[PDB]
Structures are given as C-alpha cells and as structure tokens.
Amino acid sequence: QLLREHWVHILVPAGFVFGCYLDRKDDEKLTAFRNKSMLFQRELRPNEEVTWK
Amino acid sequence: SKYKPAPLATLPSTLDPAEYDVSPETRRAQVERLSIRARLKREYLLQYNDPKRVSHIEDPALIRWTYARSANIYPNFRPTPKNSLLGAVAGFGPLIFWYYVFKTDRDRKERLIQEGKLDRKFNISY
Amino acid sequence: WDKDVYPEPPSRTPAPSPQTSLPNPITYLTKAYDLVVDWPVTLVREFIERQHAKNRTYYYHRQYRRVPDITECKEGDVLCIYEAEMQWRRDFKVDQEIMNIIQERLKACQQREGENYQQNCAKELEQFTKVTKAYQDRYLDLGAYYSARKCLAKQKQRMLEERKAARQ
Amino acid sequence: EPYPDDGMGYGDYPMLPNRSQHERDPWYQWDHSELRMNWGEPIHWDLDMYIRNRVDTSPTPV
Amino acid sequence: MLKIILPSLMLLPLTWLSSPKKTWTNVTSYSFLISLTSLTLLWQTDENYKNFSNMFSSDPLSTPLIILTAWLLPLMLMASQNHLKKDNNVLQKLYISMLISLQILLIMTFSATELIMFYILFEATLIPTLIIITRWGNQTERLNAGIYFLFYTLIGSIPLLIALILIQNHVGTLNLMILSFTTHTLDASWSNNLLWLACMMAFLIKMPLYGVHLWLPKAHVEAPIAGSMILAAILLKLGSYGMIRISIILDPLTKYMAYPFILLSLWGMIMTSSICLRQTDLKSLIAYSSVSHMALVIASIMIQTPWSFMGATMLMIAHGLTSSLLFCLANSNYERIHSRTMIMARGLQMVFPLMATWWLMASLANLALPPSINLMGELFITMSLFSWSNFTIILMGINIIITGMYSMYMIITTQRGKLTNHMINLQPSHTRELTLMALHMIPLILLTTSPKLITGLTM
Amino acid sequence: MNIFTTSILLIFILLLSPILISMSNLIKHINFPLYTTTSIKFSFIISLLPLLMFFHNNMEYMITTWHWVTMNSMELKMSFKTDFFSILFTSVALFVTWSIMQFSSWYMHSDPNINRFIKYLTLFLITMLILTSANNMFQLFIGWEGVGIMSFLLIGWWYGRTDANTAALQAILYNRIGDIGFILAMVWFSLNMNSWELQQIMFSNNNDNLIPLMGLLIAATGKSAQFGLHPWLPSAMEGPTPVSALLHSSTMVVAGIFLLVRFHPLTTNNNFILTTMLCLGALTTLFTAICALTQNDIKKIIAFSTSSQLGLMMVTLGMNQPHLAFLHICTHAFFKAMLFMCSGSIIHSLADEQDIRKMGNITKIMPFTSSCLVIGSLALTGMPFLTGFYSKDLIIEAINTCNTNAWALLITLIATSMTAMYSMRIIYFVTMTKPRFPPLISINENDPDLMNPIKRLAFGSIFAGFVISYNIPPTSIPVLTMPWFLKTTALIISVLGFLIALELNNLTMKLSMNKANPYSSFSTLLGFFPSIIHRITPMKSLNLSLKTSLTLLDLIWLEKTIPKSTSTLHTNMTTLTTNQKGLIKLYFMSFLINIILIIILYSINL
Amino acid sequence: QWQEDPEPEDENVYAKNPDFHGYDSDPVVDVWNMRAVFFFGFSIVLVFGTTFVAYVPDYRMQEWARREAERLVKYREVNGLPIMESNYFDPSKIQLPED
Amino acid sequence: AFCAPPAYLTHQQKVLRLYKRALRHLESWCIHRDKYRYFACLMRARFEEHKNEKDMMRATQLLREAEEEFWQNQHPQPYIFPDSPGGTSFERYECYKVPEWCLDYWHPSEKAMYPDYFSKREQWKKLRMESWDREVKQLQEETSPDGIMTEALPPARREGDLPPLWWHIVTRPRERP
Ligand SMILES: CCCCCCCCCCCCO[C@@H]1O[C@H](CO)[C@@H](O[C@H]2O[C@H](CO)[C@@H](O)[C@H](O)[C@H]2O)[C@H](O)[C@H]1O
Ligand SMILES: CCCCCCCCCCCCO[C@@H]1O[C@H](CO)[C@@H](O[C@H]2O[C@H](CO)[C@@H](O)[C@H](O)[C@H]2O)[C@H](O)[C@H]1O
C-alpha cells in the first residue's frame, strides 16, 4: 500500500489529541475547591455528582 | 564681483577665476581627468552592452563608500581631547538638560497636587 | 432601550403651517422614499422577525453573589485575596461602564439642546461632575497594577486626611 | 586629498568638493542617471545628503 | 496549553521523517494549523485569567504574543524557502528544526507562570538564535554579531538570575500570581535600588535600551531573513513582557528609579530615528527604526499607567508585524541584487508594481497612519507621557516628524525615481513572496478592525 | 430620521463603490473613469437632499454608526456630525469633484494608469469627507492623515521626476509639523475632558484652552499653508493639473480653516488665539499676494492666489466670524476649481506649456476657455453679485468695522488690491497680447469632457454664492452702518489694483530695458524663504544625524565605552595571567608566597 | 591559491518552468506547496480564525459589564441613591488607626 | 546629450555659450517678440564690436567682465523649455520608459499576444550576439597607444559590422512611450 509516505500525517494530530488528554488530566489533578468557593457554591442539582467535572 | 559665495550657495563656474586659466599645467590636468573618465566609461559600457551578461554591474565605488561609512569608521578612530569632549557633551548634555526639565515640571506638579491647588476636573483616564 | 437609564425628552415638533404656493420637494421625496425604500425593507424585516418568532431562545444576565471583601480576610491569604480581587475587578469594570453611560447622557444632551446647552444641560453636567468626583476618589492615581489592596490604601489615606482636617 | 588626520574615522577616504548633485551637468549621460555620477567615480562622503532630492548648494542670483 | 505545545513538538519528528520533497509542504501546513489552534486562547468571557495548571497560564498580555509567535513560524518557513534552495536536505531540515524549537520555547516562555521558568526559557532561546545567525549568515561579521548578541544578553541576564534567587529566598516562591497578590512595598534602601537594577537590566538590554542597543543592528545586518523576522518580532518583546511582569513587585521604587531610563529611551528614540535618515544599509535602517520604536515601549512601561500599558502592548504587536514585513520586503530585493545598500536599487516600482504596494502599506504602518494599531499604540503612549510631563510632547513631536521623513525616504529612494536599468536580474516577484507580504498585512488590517484583542492587562 | 441618515450614509457607500470595483476584474470590462464620474454625480444628487432638509428646518444630527472599541471609560465609536458646515461642504465638494473627475477623463486620457488616477482622486474625496463629517477628533485625524497621504501619492504622480518626489515629501513634512499640534490638541482634550467627541469637548468653554487651541492653530497653519508652513502648497504644482484643481486649492488646503471653524466655540473666548490668527492670516495674505506678482507660471500664480485667499479666511477667523469664513470656503471652491480647470485646458491645448511668457492671444484663439477664465478671475476679485462677492465683500466690511490690528487691516486691504493686480497679470499676459506660442497650432477645446464641467463650474461661480447666501440660516449679525468709503472700499481698492496693474503691464511694451529690482527679486524668488530654509535646516539636521548620532556616538563612543573596553580589559588580563615561563622554580616560589599569605591571614585573624 | 570552487553564476528561475511560484524547482511540488500555503493560510486560518474570534461572546465581560451598569443606574436612580459614591469600601468595615 | 563633453572648452565655445545664455535671459526679460528682437540686435552689436581682439588676454578680461554682468542682470526666474532640465515636465515620462530587457520575463501567455514582435526581437538579439565579439575586437584594436583617451566611439570600419557599443544607443526607450 501507500502507507510508507502518508503515515507521517498522523504525528501532529496525534500530538493535539494527546495534548487535549494531558490537559484533561491536569484538570483532574486540580479538582479541589470544585464546589467550595465562596462564589459558585450552589448545591448539586438532582442526579448531579460534580459541578464541572 | 558683487556675488559673495556661501557654503550653501557655492560660487558659479562662469564667475570662477580658476576656469579662465589656460596654463599648460591645468590643461594637462584636465586632459588626464578626462582620460580617467574615458577609461572608466569604456569599461562600464563594455560591461553594460555585453550580451552574455546575466547580472547587474557591481559598483566598486559604491562598495568602497559603504565600507568607509560603516566598517572602516572604528579602525581609524583615535581618541583626542576634542573627540572626547564632543562625545561626552553630545551623549550626556541633552540627557542632563531633559532630566532637569522633566524633574522640575514633575516636582512643581506634585507640590500643586499635595497642596490641593491643581484643578484636576475631568481627569479620569491618565 | 430603557428610558430611565437613557432619558430622552419628549419631542416637540411644530405643525407644518405652509405659507407658499410652491410645492415642498422634501414632502414628495419623503413620499417616494416611504413607498420605494421604506416598504420593501419593512416587509423583509417583518419576514425576518416572523422567522425569529419560531426558533426563539432566551439568554440570561449572569448574577454574581457578593463574596468577602479585601478588608474581611487576612494578609497573605491568597484564596481570600483572589476572591476579593476578582470581585473588585468586576466592580471596577462596571464603574467604567457607568462612567460611559453618563458621558453618553451628557453628549446626547449637548447635541439635543444645541444652542441652549449652556443652560438646559445643567442636570447632565452636574451629574457628570459629581459622578466624576466619585470616580476620581475611587480609582484615580492607582497604577497600571491597580488592585483592591491599592484601592483600600487610597481610601484609608483619604479618610485619615479627612479625619485630621475635621479634628483641626 | 584625504581628510584631516583628526582620528574621526575618515581614514584614507578622499575629500571631494562639497557640491550638491544639482550642480552636475544635467545634459550629460551619467551612468547613474539620477545620482548624476559615473560608474567607478569616487563617491562623496555625504552623497546621500547631497542627492538631488535633499540638500541643494547651487549658486543663486542673490 | 499543552494542546498547543505538543503539536509544535511533533512538528520536529514530522520534519525529520517527511520525504525530502514534501517536508516543506507538510511542516508549513501543520504550522499553520497549530497557529489556528492557538486561537483558542482568545475565548475569554470573564476577567479570570486562564490558568491551565501549576506550570502554564494565559492573560490578555500573554495571549497576543503567543498567537503572534504561533502565526510567525509558517511565515518564517515560507521566507526561508529560497536562500535555503541549494543546501543539503539534512541542512534544510536542521534549519526547520531550529525554527520549530524557537517557536516551542517562545510559546513556553510566554505561557510560563514562574519567573525562574521564564528565565530558563528566555535564555534557552539564545542557542537556536545564535545557531541560525552564525550558521546561515552570508558575511564574515556574523560571528562577531552573534558574539555581541549572546553576551549583551548574558551579562544582563546573570544579575536577573541573582535577583530572582534573592526574591525566592525572601518570599518563598516565584509564582507570578502569588507575588502579585502578596506584593508589599520596598524600602528605599541602596540594596533595594540595586535589586531594582538587577531585575530590570536584562529586559532593558533585550528591549534594547538606547545605550546598549549596539547588538541589534549587527544581528539584523548579519542574520538571515528568518533570524531577522523572529528577532524583531518576538525576541525584542521578550524584554517588554518581562518588564511588565516583574515590575509588579518593584514598587514604589519605580517612581524615582525610572528617570534615567525614561530619559535614555526618550532621547534615544530621537537619536535613532535620526540615524535612520542617513543609514545606507536598508536592514540597518529597519533595525534602527525598531530601536526607536522600542524606546516608546520602554518609556510607557516605565511610567506605568493604564494607558501606558495598553499602548505598549498594542505597539508591541503592531511593531512585531510591521518590522517583520519590512524585513521581508528588504530581503525580497536582496535575494535579487545581493546588496543591502539602499541607493543601489531604485525605481523598483516600474518593474514590481504590486511589491511597491506592499512597500507603501508597510511604510504607512511604520509611520503610523490612522486608524492603524501602530497609531493606536503610539497615540496612547503619547497621551500617557503627556500626562506624565507636558514637555514630553516636544520629543514625541520631533520623533514623529523624523519618523515620517525616514519612512517616506525609504520608499522614495527604493521604489521611486528612475529604474536602475543595468540590473538584468530583477526577476518578477514570486507568488511565495507576495503571499508572505499578504500574510504580514492581513492580520494587521484585521487587528485594526478589532483592536480590543491586543489591549493588555490594564484595559 | 431615516431619510436623512440614509442619505448621509449612502453618499459614502456610493463613493466607496468605485474603490471596490477597482479590486475586481470588472474594471477591465467597464469604462472606469465614466463609472466613477457617474458615481460622483449620483452622490452629489443624493447629498442635495440633506442640504434641502437643513435649509428647511436647520436641524443638525449626530449619527453614531459603529462602536469601534471601548477604552476604560472612553468609548471610541464612529460618529458623524452633520450640521451646517458638513452638510454644505459635502455638496460643494461633490459638485467640484464631479466636474474635476469628468475633466480628468480628458486631461489624462493619454496617460496609462488613468484608472489608478481616478481611484486616487476618489480616495482623496472619501478621506476629505471623512475629515469634514466626524464627531470624534480621532476620526477627524483619520481623515486628516489620509488626506495628506493621498496628497503625497498624487503630487508626483510621475514618480520618475525627482522634483515631484521632493515636492511630495515636502508636503508630507510641512503637514507633519502641523500634525504635531493636532496630536497635542488630541492629548490635551483626552486628559482634561476625557473625550474626543465635540459634544463633550463643548463643555470646555470656561477653561483656559490656550494649549489645545495653540495646537489646533499650529495644525491649521500647517495644513492650510499659512506663512510659517506655506512653501509646500506653491511647490505642490508638480502633480497633474486635476490634482492641483481638486486637492491643493478646492478642498485639501481648506482643512485647517475647517478645523478652526469646527472648534470655533472654544476660540471665541480666547483673545490671544484670535489675535494670533488675525496677525498670521494678514501676514500670509500680504506675503503670498506679493509672491504672486512676478510669477511666470500659471499654476504657480493660481496656487499663490489660493494661499492668499486662505490667509484671508484666517483673518476672518481671527475676527469672530467662523460662519463667514466657512461661507468663503464654499464660495471660493467653485471659482478656484474653475480657474485651475481653465489653466489646465490652456496648458493641454498648447504643447504642455505653463509659462505665461509663451502664451497670449488666448482671448481670440480660445473664446470659451478665455470667457470662463475671465468669469473666474472676476469672481476671485470682488465683482458685485458673483460667487466671490457674497463672501469677500462681507469679509472686507467686517474687517473695516471691527476692533482689529491697524497693520493687519492695512496689509489685508493691500493684499485685496494685489489680488486684482495678479489676476490682471494673468488676464493680460495670457489673453490680451500677440501670440507667443510655437508656430504650429493644434488647439481643440471642442470636447464635451472639457466643455461641460467648465460650464457647470461657471454656472457655479455666477449663481452659487447668491443661492447659498440666501438659503443659509442667519448665523451672525453683520454691521451694515458705516461711512460710504468703508462700505465701498472693496470695490474701490479692487478697481485701483486693476488700473495700476493695467498701467504697469501696458508699460512693458515700451522699448526700455527692465532692470532688476530688489523688491522684484524678493517677489520672484518667493521672499528667499525656500532658498534659505530648505538649504540651512535640512543641511544642519542631516549633518547632525550623520556626524553626531551615527558616527560619533553609535559607531565610535558607544563601541569604545562598553563592548570594546570590556573586551580589551579581559584580553589584557588573559595575557597578564598566561605568560608563565613554565619553570617549576617559579611555580614553587609562587606556592611559597601563597603559603606565607595563608599563614599571615590565620595569624592576624587569630 | 587554495583549491577552491568558483562562485556559481546567477540563475533565472523562470527560464525553465515559467510557472514558477517561488517554492520549489520541481513544478508539481511547487504548485502543491503554493496550494497548501494558500489553503491553510487564507482559506482555513484567516477565514475560520476570523469568524471564531468574531463570535467569541462577551469578550472579557464587555457586554455583561454594560448590562450591569444599566441595571445599577436604573436601580440607584429609582431609589435615589448616588450613582457612584466616593468610598468603594463601606467606612465601617475599615478600622482606622487611632490618631 | 548624445555627444560627450571635451576635457575643456575653448574661448570660442565659452563666448558662444555666454551669447546663447544672454540672449535667452534677454528674451525672458523682454516678454514681447518685437522688444526682444530689438534688444537682441543690440546685444549682437555689443558682441560683434569685440569680435576682433588679438590680445588673448584682453579677450579673457572682456569675457570675465561680461560674465560678471550676466550674473548681475540675469533673470531671477528665466524661461526653461518644458522638456529641458529644470522645466516643468522634464522627467515626466521616465515612469513609462521600461527598458527592453524586461520583455525577457514575459510569460509565454503574454508573448502569445504579440507573435510577430517577438519574432523580430529574436532576430535583433541574434544580430547583437553575432556583432558583439567583432565590435569588442574593433574597440580593442582601436585603443590609442598613448593613454589620452576620449568617450568618442569609432564607426564601423569594415563591412557588415555594426558600430561598437550600439545596443544601448539603439533600443533605448522612446521619448513618449
Ligand atoms: C551594560 C552591560 C551590558 C553590556 C555588556 C557588553 C559586553 C559585550 C562583550 C562582547 C565582546 C565583543 O568582543 C569582540 O570580539 C571581537 C572578535 O570578534 C573583536 O573584534 C574586533 O577586534 C579588533 C578591534 O577591537 C579588530 O582588530 C578586529 O579585527 C575586530 O574583529 C571586538 O573588538 C570585540 O569587541
Ligand atoms: C563584565 C564581565 C563580563 C566578562 C565577559 C564578557 C565577555 C567578554 C569577552 C572577552 C573576550 C573577547 O575576546 C576578544 O577576542 C577578539 C578576537 O576574537 C580580540 O580581537 C583581537 O583582534 C586582533 C587579533 O586577532 C588584534 O589585532 C586586536 O587588537 C584584538 O582585539 C579582542 O581583543 C578580544 O577582546
């Protein structure tokens, strides 16, 4: 097939997807204060487990 | 003559005493200058009309001028009392002058504001 | 458009009262305009609004609850200071827009009163002056790094000066 | 004729008369037409000041 | 921010794994896509600056510079496609790698949250720049130019490192947000004055300041086109950005420590705008215009007002675009006639009618034609300085007149007059070159349309 | 109002349409000059409607079209201020530009890039309208700067010339020297009133205003070419005759007068600024009226006439008569554009000859152009009941019946006489003589593109002053009670100037050699102001920029002081330290010295 | 003299391949590089980037601030309170140092 | 313009140049044709009075006095022909004077719009190529032994030879393109 010349067109998109994943992980690490700020301190609505995940 | 030349209104040529001297020395000098002009023009025209030429004509005189005005200024600079005095004055004197101007203005303004006498009316942006 | 925020006096147009035999070109030009230009545009706008009536959606003006001020929590508590600083920045951004609203009021009054602005824009000019003094006392002379702490320091210095003068 | 040896960086460069390009012969066929200079001719130190667009030093009736 | 950083890293393996024919196409296209992605930083719908993690952040001051850095790299790659036409494929890929590594480091620098990380990256950018200048310059003075560029920065940077270490020892952290929120006044002791100088000297040298600018004309004259582009566009703004960031903890000493540098910048802007009137090298003329323009940024940041900061940011962005456009325009003629002397080429509008239009637009932006963001920044800096002292208007007006004069002189000398007919090698303008100029100009027009994006922290 | 605002915006839309068409391929399929001329014509017709409404109800509008950006308590929004001045000037300028755009289709027919020429003229019209209809000082400045840039691009339309490039850059320089004052006014108003809109500025009536008013006065001096910054306008004749007719006479040069008129309410209460304006205008009037005499170039004479008239407008503003000054602007546009068009027709018909010493007998060889030229000349002079009259007569009456500088008044009257003097110079040397032009004759007025626009401008120069003076609302209270001599001074001095110039011109045919006169040379060589300033100022400035900043400081001393000094110091230390002989004897002697030093250190430190 | 190569001569790029776009000597690679530049630079980044930036909503609370300002102006004028008061912080909250 | 100046002008040349300038400035002073003719006849009478002067020192003295008088009485603003240096429309048409070599870069699509013109142009270029070697040889052999050279160029001496350095003199842009 013609893969040996076009496979190289997955690096940068893969980098972007991996960066989005790493950003989500960094979001997870800072979960503290999720619903505990003086502002934005509403009670969870029914069937709601996290304010902004 | 009633026309007195100035550095920015140079003496004409028809009023120039040196244009009416027919001495063989000056005549030889003028002929030599024309010979130099002719040789340079011949070389330039040969290059200009060369049908195999594929680029512009480099100008040694222009290269020399740019080199002299840029890269050769420092190698041929020697500090002297006049050089040092001029350098210090030009470099700093304007700075000291404008420092005093700005500082006196700012100090007077600040004294006015401290005393409350400055009429800051619709000043809102600063 | 809310008239209470943006007061626009009632118009006082005089009656035509023509006193000549010639026809007024502007009346016929306005008739031709109201026919050719004003009517198809009105129909297109009505169609657009009819389409908007369907697929109608609502958006809300966000409300922020007051949080503890800068004065209300301790030196070096970055959490408190961040909350109070964001609140102060919000209030400062809103003060700027109130300033803008009153400046628009003043400019519209000047244009409207026209030649009587020296006498019939007294209310707007006085409002501008008073609100301008308030703005200056609040925010003027704070650095490009203005912050709730600098505003508090400025207010406390002004209060100390006022108190000293009152004592004397 | 070189510049005076006052150590101002001129070095070996010649000193040509301080005459604007306006004064060169306008009917001649100069190699550098608007500079009114020939190819290879030594260039004045202040040529860019004396070009026909800038400082003019031509004689005057008064 | 990692969603911008990581694809930039992946550009490098793409460069080294792409076939020799498709390398330029692939790298340029994906750089353009990364530049598009970087626009996600403009989605700020509140006053709460973006904080992605403990290590990266974005504010109204950082986002414009990050987007400009992301945008420039495709332009540099395009500009470098001709003078690297003869080099080996390994060498071309090495050059692409240097440019990509510069982009990554600059984006990391502008997104940094800690002053020490800022320092590490802001000094890491030197290696790619030195390599680009020295390994791909055309004249024998590129080595000395690189030495100047390196050591002017290093000498000023070491005191910056000492000051940062001292601040971290005293406070316990270097996080910019913590420093801003827990900032306290500085006693006016001699040690604190020396701390102020150590904090500001590196950035002032990078700006550059009037007395220590000799490294910039050399670097621009000896650098390749991409080197000049990135330098003028971003590496000068590193100093202004650092000054804006670090001045938040140096108050109130600024009020009296800014006089020497305010005066130096105000006078040196005139003294360099004047040099632009009688500079023979076109690249040197552009470099000195940049020095004079950056004097304004220095002065405005020093006086520190809501207007000064916004004007400084707007002028930073506008100069970043305009100086790069001017350098590309000059390099277009250089690649044809192989001389930087301005007098050598004349009447070029008779053979490049559209390049002359680009020249005119670039020059008008340079002299600040309203409503251009150039003039927005310059006007607001002028107003802030006028409020500072009412006699600054004299110097500002002199500089304005000189700027108009030299800007129009460039055009009249190069694009107008009688064509230098002896130049048979003036080939028609490349589509690549015209696209480069268009990509430099269109963002300027759009930012003029929407200037709210390039205001700074203050407004 | 919908109709009024729609007309105001549609004028700009129509003007912008040709600019957009020039960026598409349709410009090759259409006749671009004719399309642009039609666009200007329709813009004029549309603009005639707001003019009628203002004449009827005398209402003025503030129209905010677009919110550009808000800058912390200062909103910059595109705003148009449509009042008496803007409404009247828009119509006058559109009429003049319609005529000149039609004329250029003929004058520049041979010249390639006529499409670019038409686009440049349209751009200048757009920018001038932006300037004249703008609430914000910032939008006014956009127009102010774009007008100068289009002036640069048009002066030296033939960029092959070097004189043309010098004239264009001269215009740019002399206009930036006034843009400094404009920016001074902008910054002062921004700081002290926190706004650039005239509505909010108006509440600065009771302040000092000396600084902002002086800034505006410097800007007006620069832009309208008052005595201080005047050389550029006479030198702006390098460009095409249509450029001269439109920009540097009919519309561009009146920008400073328009700015002062716009800010008139503030300068009403500042006696210093009014006195300065009066004196400056009187000086400019006298100086340029003198310079116009003894000028052997039709375009140069007309340019100096324009400068003199602008000086008169500045005198009118020095007196508190802003409405009268604007009325003179509007009236003068007509006949000045007509005069320039007629001169262009003469120059085109002759083999591009501008010197009047090679013309003559045009009254017979070109009846139509000669008649239009004489109409324009009499209009320029105070011929009763022509477009010039309803402004010049009232200006002279107000000058006489006011508290004014005696010298300003006297030299203003002398200049009013010199106006007729140089008009008679043109008439005599270009009409009332024997033919001095080359022997082969190829003169053809018969072309509609030439004839029609001049006919329109002639109807203007005859009736527009009357129509406007009657339609405009009452503005100020004139003084109509004065001695017979004060009332008739305008006519008397104009006729005296005509007769004196006629006698002097008749005396030229006498076979007596004309000897050079000191005053004749002062007039001819423009008072030596160019010859001296344009040589001393640039020479000193450029010599400083090279010998001081670049050579002395940047290339020499700033190298010696920092990099070279540091490098030399460390190159000296390295050679001092690394010249070791390589002898263990000396190395161990040094080690012994080190040991002794350490022992001493410990001993004295305890 | 050392054994050095001579200076290469000036080339006309359009001499061969008069459809040269400045990108590459190979015509196909050149045209495709030009197409990629024009597509990803103008069609993608500039158009879509401009649209996205334009439709960023309420950029930095510019609109919310104006709506709040209108609300507060109406409320304060209806209730008779000052539009803006010279003390941002209620002076009761502040404990001024004695003397 | 076509001829190159000599190393120097002779007395006759200087006197003739002075005569031409004096008559032109006299025409500028006397606007009218009849007056100009009268005064020009008088001026020629003055010139002729000293047409015979074998004291080549009293000739130079007369010339210098005349030049002083000319600089004293010259028109401050003389009359310049529109196309001459200093006259309006001097270099007016230098924008449209595109040199011939610009046609080398025309796209084949653009040359297809003038099939015959470029057919003849190829013949002209072939002629230039054939001639160049012979013309450079002619100049090289014509070079004078003594260094006293001039800008004057030789004509074609043999047959089928073009004059040396002819390509730029020919093919120069037309005065009114
Ligand atoms: C304010 C603090 C920040 C400013 C700090 C300044 C430190 C800068 C030091 C950079 C050192 C530059 O070191 C530079 O070395 C080069 C070698 O290429 C020397 O190069 C030069 O040397 C001498 C002239 O002196 C010549 O004979 C030689 O041909 C020339 O190349 C420079 O003379 C020297 O200046
Ligand atoms: C403030 C502390 C900072 C210290 C560090 C800053 C960096 C300083 C670098 C010092 C070294 C510079 O090294 C520099 O080398 C160049 C050549 O390369 C020398 O250049 C030399 O050129 C030739 C010989 O080659 C000699 O004729 C000339 O006199 C000499 O200058 C410089 O004289 C030397 O100064």
UniProtKB/Swiss-Prot annotation, chain A:
One of its GO terms (cellular component) is mitochondrial inner membrane. The chain crosses the membrane at residues 6-22. Its main location: mitochondrion. It comes from the Eukaryota. It is a single-pass membrane protein. The keyword Electron transport applies. It is found in: Mitochondrion inner membrane. One of its GO terms (biological process) is proton motive force-driven mitochondrial ATP synthesis. The keyword Transmembrane applies. InterPro entries: NDUB1. Accessory subunit of the mitochondrial membrane respiratory chain NADH dehydrogenase (Complex I) that is believed not to be involved in catalysis. Complex I functions in the transfer of electrons from NADH to the respiratory chain. The immediate electron acceptor for the enzyme is believed to be ubiquinone. Complex I is composed of 45 different subunits. This is NADH dehydrogenase [ubiquinone] 1 beta subcomplex subunit 1. It comes from Mus musculus. The lineage of its organism: Eukaryota, Metazoa, Chordata, Craniata, Vertebrata. The gene is Ndufb1.
Curated annotation (Swiss-Prot), chain B:
Keywords: Acetylation, Electron transport, Membrane, Mitochondrion, Mitochondrion inner membrane, Phosphoprotein, Respiratory chain, Transmembrane, Transmembrane helix, Transport. It is a single-pass membrane protein. It is found in: Mitochondrion inner membrane. Signal peptide: none annotated. The keyword Transmembrane helix applies. It comes from the Eukaryota. PANTHER family: NADH DEHYDROGENASE [UBIQUINONE] 1 BETA SUBCOMPLEX SUBUNIT 4, NADH-UBIQUINONE OXIDOREDUCTASE B15 SUBUNIT. Complex I is composed of 45 different subunits. Accessory subunit of the mitochondrial membrane respiratory chain NADH dehydrogenase (Complex I), that is believed not to be involved in catalysis. Complex I functions in the transfer of electrons from NADH to the respiratory chain. The immediate electron acceptor for the enzyme is believed to be ubiquinone. This is NADH dehydrogenase [ubiquinone] 1 beta subcomplex subunit 4. It comes from Mus musculus.
UniProtKB/Swiss-Prot annotation, chain C:
Keywords: Electron transport, Membrane, Mitochondrion, Mitochondrion inner membrane, Phosphoprotein, Respiratory chain, Transport. Residues 1-6 have a biased composition (Basic and acidic residues). It holds the Pfam family NDUFB10. The modification Phosphoserine is found at S17, S147. It is found in: Mitochondrion inner membrane. Its main location: mitochondrion. GO terms for cellular component: mitochondrial inner membrane; mitochondrion; respiratory chain complex I. Residues 7-17 have a biased composition (Pro residues). GO terms for biological process: aerobic respiration; proton motive force-driven mitochondrial ATP synthesis. Belongs to the complex I NDUFB10 subunit family. Complex I is composed of 45 different subunits. Interacts with CHCHD4. This is NADH dehydrogenase [ubiquinone] 1 beta subcomplex subunit 10. It comes from Mus musculus.
From Swiss-Prot, chain D:
It is found in: Mitochondrion inner membrane. It comes from the Eukaryota. Complex I is composed of 45 different subunits. Accessory subunit of the mitochondrial membrane respiratory chain NADH dehydrogenase (Complex I), that is believed not to be involved in catalysis. Complex I functions in the transfer of electrons from NADH to the respiratory chain. The immediate electron acceptor for the enzyme is believed to be ubiquinone. Belongs to the complex I NDUFB8 subunit family. This is NADH dehydrogenase [ubiquinone] 1 beta subcomplex subunit 8, mitochondrial. It comes from Mus musculus. The chain holds residues 63 to 124 of 186 of the full protein.
